[PDB]
Amino acid sequence: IVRPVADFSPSLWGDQFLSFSIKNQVAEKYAKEIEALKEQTRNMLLATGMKLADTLNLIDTIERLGISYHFEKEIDDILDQIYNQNSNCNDLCTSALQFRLLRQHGFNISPEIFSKFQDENGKFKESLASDVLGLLNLYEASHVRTHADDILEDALAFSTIHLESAAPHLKSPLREQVTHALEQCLHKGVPRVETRFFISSIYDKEQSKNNVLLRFAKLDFNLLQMLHKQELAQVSRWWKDLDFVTTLPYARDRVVECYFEALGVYFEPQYSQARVMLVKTISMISIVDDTFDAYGTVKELEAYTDAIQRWDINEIDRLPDYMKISYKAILDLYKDYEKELSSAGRSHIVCHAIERMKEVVRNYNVESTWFIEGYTPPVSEYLSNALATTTYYYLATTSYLGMKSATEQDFEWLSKNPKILEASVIICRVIDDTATYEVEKSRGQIATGIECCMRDYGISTKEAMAKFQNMAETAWKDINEGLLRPTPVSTEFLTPILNLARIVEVTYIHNLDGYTHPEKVLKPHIINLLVDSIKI
Ligand SMILES: C/C=C(\C)CC/C=C(\C)CCC=C(C)C
Ligand SMILES: [Mg+2]
Ligand SMILES: [Mg+2]
């Protein structure tokens, strides 16, 4: 049997992550000062008689500095109270910020706060075009719209045109903040990435900066980075022992990239265990994808699918040699999962993640069949299979495994394919097909998402690409709507789904597969998040 040619580039990273020894003295020094700075920060938030604009600017700063995970109660109480006071404020800057912070935290504040800034048609008064800060905040707020927010239909285009016009003459670092926002808005960015940029390129360079807050953010970012470095070391050891880089040389070698993805789903230390489990699944399912996609044969892929469906060690002998590697590693990864959760009595929940992995594999197989036959389904039929081949129902289920508070009713909710999860899956799927379109019409892909769409509707490649853009916009409005209270589960179980959508946007920025081709988009992030500390 003849297999296809290996074209995946090797891991950029070698072994620079394989061993990290925490300087335990440094850590304890950071932690001790952090405790002091934490209380100073708290007392800032609990301070009385602050004006509205100063309270929102404080919370916004703490959030961009990446330290708001320390003050979830205090921030919640202050925004709640702001929500219920429905105060009037005649300042675009403060109104737009009030809107974004409330919406991001689930409070369904009314978009009518923006009507006083519009003319008749509900178009923004162009007299506002010289209010750079107001424009900046309207621009960030315009990314948290729901379907009930068509007052804001114009805010993105209006704020964008005038930020571009103003940017070249703005002072620093405001200029760099605006330029960055136009390339990457806050709401759809990965939080650690946005936080590293804010600390280093913006706040550190602010004439007005608060020194307590800056030192806090620098120390906290560097202290957490040490934890992530440990995790990546241990995950890097795990990957090494499996040695798929030699035994399965057809597969992408990307455990570091998988770690970055999992660090986007959550970065806080309380999710250390969840983070490590999640990375391992991403790795493994990336292997199964390379097998179906650029190596295995029709007959082989079917025995793989059946074996996965059956999910029993007895089945290895039914599969060719190399597939036995994949198969046993998968089954043992899940025995390990069951062991990690024993102590706490949560071993049973592994089966949810398993059922979603079986589903992924089935749909890989269907997609193979469609390719071998040259079948070009209608869009509806394409999606009923290709949504799950994003792995996003699978990764979202996985993300809960390590979260100690995840209950069985939380997994029940996720199994019913709730609206927020589906939106996140749709974003992943259409970003994929827009990016990997051409590159797969080269390898003779006949059932690419875009193709199905053109043939189904009778429309050119462009119009089809714009139709996928619309499903993504619809999907982001659905995610934003899914964060509004009352939430169907704790917000703690909603954020991973939202972060899954962020991860996809950040990895395919500028329409290029950054996981397979990490050097251009993911490499600078991995360096800023996992190599270089923030110079204090
Ligand atoms: C956008 C396309 C994909 C995501 C492919 C399916 C996912 C993987 C093969 C895991 C690595 C990439 C992540 C963004 C988690
Ligand atoms: Mg694939
Ligand atoms: Mg494929």
From Swiss-Prot:
State the function annotated in the UniProt record.
Answer: Catalyzes the cyclization of trans,trans-farnesyl diphosphate (FPP) to the bicyclic intermediate 5-epi-aristolochene, initial step in the conversion of FPP to the sesquiterpenoid antifungal phytoalexin capsidiol. Produces germacrene A as an enzyme-bound intermediate that is not released by the enzyme, but is further cyclized to produce the bicyclic 5-epi-aristolochene. Mediates, at low levels, the formation of 4-epi-eremophilene and premnaspirodiene from trans,trans-farnesyl diphosphate.
GO function terms (MF aspect)? 5-epi-aristolochene synthase activity; magnesium ion binding; terpene synthase activity
Quick one: which residues bind Mg(2+) 3? Answer: 432-433, 436, 440
Keyword Metal-binding included in the entry's annotation: yes
EC number(s)?
A: 4.2.3.61, 4.2.3.226, 4.2.3.227
- List the source organism: Nicotiana tabacum (Common tobacco)
GO cellular component, alphabetical, reads:
cytoplasm
The text the record gives for the protein's domains is: The Asp-Asp-Xaa-Xaa-Asp/Glu (DDXXD/E) motif is important for the catalytic activity, presumably through binding to Mg(2+).
Is Metal-binding among the key words of this record? yes
Which cofactors does this gene product need?
Mg(2+)
Assembly and interaction partners? Monomer.
Protein's cellular compartments: Cytoplasm
> What induces it, per record?
By fungal elicitor.
Question: Motif range for DDXXD motif?
Answer: 289-293
Q: Which family does it belong to?
A: Belongs to the terpene synthase family.
Binding, (2E,6E)-farnesyl diphosphate: 252, 289, 293, 429, 432
Where along this sequence does the record place binding of Mg(2+) 1? 289, 293
* GO annotation, biological process: diterpenoid biosynthetic process; sesquiterpene biosynthetic process
Post-translational events: Self-alkylated at Tyr-508 in the presence of (2Z,6E)-farnesyl diphosphate ((Z,E)-FPP). Self-alkylated at Asp-432 at warm temperature (42 degrees Celsius) in the presence of (2E,6E)-farnesyl diphosphate ((E,E)-FPP).
Query: Per its record, how is this protein called by name?
Result: 5-epi-aristolochene synthase
Gene for this protein?
A: EAS3
Q: Which Gene3D superfamilies match?
A: Farnesyl Diphosphate Synthase, Terpene synthase, N-terminal domain
Pathway in which this enzyme or protein is active: Secondary metabolite biosynthesis; terpenoid biosynthesis
